[PDB]
Design a binder for this molecule. Structure first.
Ligand code: W1O
Ligand code: ZN
Length: 258
């Protein structure tokens, strides 16, 4: 009886195994655009993905992860609110059963169809397992997805999903350039928060881009054909793998832009 996104094991249950679910810096949150303060002391973010080395794509039973070689400083996030150098380890998405839900963060209570998370860890802690134990261990770049025009840079991800339909399946996923998933503007909101899945560790600097990317209905439909279940098990479509907004408590959301 493990955690998930169903009636019996979803977000409202997680606190029983992971009491930090009710903690002081949980994610995601609603971004109230009128309350977020422009912080002129923030920097432009530095997204350096030219040497990124993607390796593999995995269906882990609650999302799919595109994994990178993080054994050297190849794809890094720096600047913005961050001190030091954060290495890209994986990206994944959260999405809905319908276009009107799926994102984890919300903007003035608006839900997007999906949300991309590019996960990076602070090189001063040496490895990801150590970094998640520190309050400044991870930086997650969040990007909203709306449904409209196709995103060309997503299609290589969409076309491999039939090969990882069920939990535990992986496929080779070399030579994928995550620059093709970015919007035009790097304007962002930032706040201190947590992993949005168990173990819900309070180790994340969140950087959420203001500009959504557009994907096509056909692209998100293929996300919704994935399975939470393993091969040969009763089919449970992988949909609604999002945690709802959590209390902001004693936090300030800062804006990079006027
Ligand atoms: N959204 S966020 O950006 O804030 C964010 C959140 C979270 C992270 C860091 N942790 C993760 O990434 N995890 C959590 C653990 N997870 C699981 C893998 C599982 C199982 C259960 C799991 F929960 C099983 O039960 C299972 C089985 O054999 O039954 C096999 N597998 C592994 C894949 C084969 C894998 C992914 C990073 C970033
Ligand atoms: Zn995530």
């Amino acid at each position: 009886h493990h955690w998930g996104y169903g009636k019996h094991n979803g977000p409202e249950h997680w606190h029983k195994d992971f009491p930090i679910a009710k903690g002081e810096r949980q994610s995601p949150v609603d971004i109230d655009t009128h309350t977020a303060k422009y912080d002129p002391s923030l920097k432009p973010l530095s997204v350096s993905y030219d040497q990124a080395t993607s390796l593999r794509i995995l269906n882990n039973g609650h999302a799919f992860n595109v994994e990178f070689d993080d054994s050297q400083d190849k794809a890094v996030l720096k600047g913005g609110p961050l001190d030091g150098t954060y290495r890209l380890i994986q990206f994944h998405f959260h999405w809905g059963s319908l276009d009107g839900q799926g994102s984890e963060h919300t903007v003035d209570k608006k839900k997007y169809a999906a949300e991309l998370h590019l996960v990076h860890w602070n090189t001063k802690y040496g490895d990801f397992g150590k970094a998640v134990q520190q309050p400044d261990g991870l930086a997650v770049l969040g990007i909203f997805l709306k449904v409209g025009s196709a995103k060309p840079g997503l299609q290589k991800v969409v076309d491999v999903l039939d090969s990882i339909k069920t939990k535990g399946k992986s496929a080779d996923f070399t030579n994928f350039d995550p620059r093709g998933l970015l919007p035009e503007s790097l304007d962002y909101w930032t706040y201190p928060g947590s992993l949005t899945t168990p173990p819900l560790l309070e180790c994340v600097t969140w950087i959420v881009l203001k500009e959504p990317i557009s994907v096509s209905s056909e692209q998100v439909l293929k996300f919704r054909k994935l399975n939470f279940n393993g091969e040969g098990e009763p089919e449970e479509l992988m949909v609604d793998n999002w945690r709802p907004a959590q209390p902001l408590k004693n936090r300030q959301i800062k804006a990079s832009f006027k």
